[PDB]
Amino acid sequence: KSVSVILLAGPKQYIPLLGQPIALYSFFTFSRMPEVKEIVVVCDPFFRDIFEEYEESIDVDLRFAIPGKERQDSVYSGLQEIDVNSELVCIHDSARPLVNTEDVEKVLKDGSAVGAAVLGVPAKATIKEVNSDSLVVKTLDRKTLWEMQTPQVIKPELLKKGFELVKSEGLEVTDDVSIVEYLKHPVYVSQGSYTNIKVTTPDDLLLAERILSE
Amino acid sequence: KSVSVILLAGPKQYIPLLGQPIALYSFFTFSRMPEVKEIVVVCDPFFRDIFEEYEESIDVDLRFAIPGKERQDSVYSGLQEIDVNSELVCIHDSARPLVNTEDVEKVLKDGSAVGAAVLGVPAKATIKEVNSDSLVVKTLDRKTLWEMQTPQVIKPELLKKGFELVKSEGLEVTDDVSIVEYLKHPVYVSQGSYTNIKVTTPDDLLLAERILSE
Ligand SMILES: [K+]
Ligand SMILES: [K+]
Ligand SMILES: [K+]
Ligand SMILES: [K+]
Ligand SMILES: [K+]
Ligand SMILES: [K+]
Ligand SMILES: [K+]
Ligand SMILES: [K+]
Ligand SMILES: [K+]
Ligand SMILES: [K+]
Ligand SMILES: [K+]
Ligand SMILES: [K+]
Ligand SMILES: [K+]
Ligand SMILES: [K+]
Ligand SMILES: [K+]
Ligand SMILES: [K+]
Ligand SMILES: [K+]
Ligand SMILES: [K+]
Ligand SMILES: [K+]
Ligand SMILES: [K+]
Ligand SMILES: [K+]
Ligand SMILES: [K+]
Ligand SMILES: [K+]
Ligand SMILES: [K+]
Ligand SMILES: [K+]
Ligand SMILES: [K+]
Ligand SMILES: [K+]
Ligand SMILES: [K+]
DSSP states (O other): OOEEEEEEOOOGGGSEETTEEHHHHHHHHHHTOTTEEEEEEEOOGGGHHHHHTTGGGSSSEEEEEOOOSSHHHHHHHHHTTSOTTOSEEEEEETTOTTOOHHHHHHHHHHHHHHSEEEEEEEOOSOEEEEOTTSBEEEEOOGGGEEEEEEEEEEOHHHHHHHHHHHHTTTOOOSSSHHHHHHTTOOOEEEEOOTTOOOOOSHHHHHHHHHHHTO | OOEEEEEEOOOGGGSEETTEEHHHHHHHHHHTOTTEEEEEEEOOGGGHHHHHTTGGGSSSEEEEEOOOSSHHHHHHHHHTTSOTTOSEEEEEETTOTTOOHHHHHHHHHHHHHHSEEEEEEEOOSOEEEEOTTSBEEEEOOGGGEEEEEEEEEEOHHHHHHHHHHHHTTTOOOSSSHHHHHHTTOOOEEEEOOTTOOOOOSHHHHHHHHHHHTO
């Protein structure tokens, strides 16, 4: 019971899906996993009650952190709240409500082994690198390209070192494992499921209801 | 009236969308464009009547070609049917029923100017190159990666030269502009719309009905 989750929830994350705010879906998935010791929800204080409500229903410590200006500052804020002895930090965008227990288990395993891991899926589209003149530079090898999801799972000492680089050099990162890439430490891509979609538009909500109804 | 369309339609392309087989949607879009002189539909002969039916409703020459084993052989088969003097070949996957007239006009313009062009959209996901050990090699620069759609628009002399390379060297290509890339001739990526989705699953059909109902 060694994993700390940072659940990034700081309104599109509170849009109802089957009547319940999207952020609660992944919250419950992590709360039922035996490896998870605590969930640090990063949200505006106004929304804390959405989660506290369920606190006596769940077998994790529930803690909060205040969001920052950019996703990386929200991650940093959650990281100050995790247990001093957690073995792994599992960072998740609450706009991904449909992550599967099996896929979380897999990226936790791979993060334990490598130190950093992220859920990904092979890209289904043909992807080309395009220069600033709108010309194709190259076609990227289909067998080689992965679309990233969350969770991103990183050992805390590694993440803390990475934030020391980020804060001391003004890095801008849009994900968590980019910090570890900077460090030249390996990042493992764990194969997930294409159903772990991000839900931000009402088109995405309709797809999420379809997936849930399958 | 200078453009020849090769419409690749050779059953998931005949699944109904609002009651009409998917392949007819883009067929009609191209038939109404003044630049299009002819549409060569590549389909099994059994399906020809789906399109012929509308022949006196449309201001293009309607022709057919027989599909081959792989997409590139189907393209080659359509290419043998185009007008000896067309200025541009516009190749489209009939599983993309929602392409917009405005986006077709744009990629035709860019194909006229460059010799090869393809509709694309910036990739919305974070994409990483991953080696065979499942490790991230690099994170690809978000500002630089495009997802390809169809049409792909190529001048016929260029395409014919490219097929001479393909047939004389056993190339396997999953798109049309890869042939021109091989030739070291420029390929322009014209910015399209994220609504030009490929419809193969019933999830995609539901999204396509939503888009059409917007
Ligand atoms: K979940
Ligand atoms: K637990
Ligand atoms: K504790
Ligand atoms: K607290
Ligand atoms: K904090
Ligand atoms: K603290
Ligand atoms: K999801
Ligand atoms: K969620
Ligand atoms: K999943
Ligand atoms: K596990
Ligand atoms: K291992
Ligand atoms: K910043
Ligand atoms: K997944
Ligand atoms: K929409
Ligand atoms: K269309
Ligand atoms: K026409
Ligand atoms: K003619
Ligand atoms: K004919
Ligand atoms: K032919
Ligand atoms: K012919
Ligand atoms: K489409
Ligand atoms: K179509
Ligand atoms: K379009
Ligand atoms: K045009
Ligand atoms: K020009
Ligand atoms: K082949
Ligand atoms: K488009
Ligand atoms: K499905």
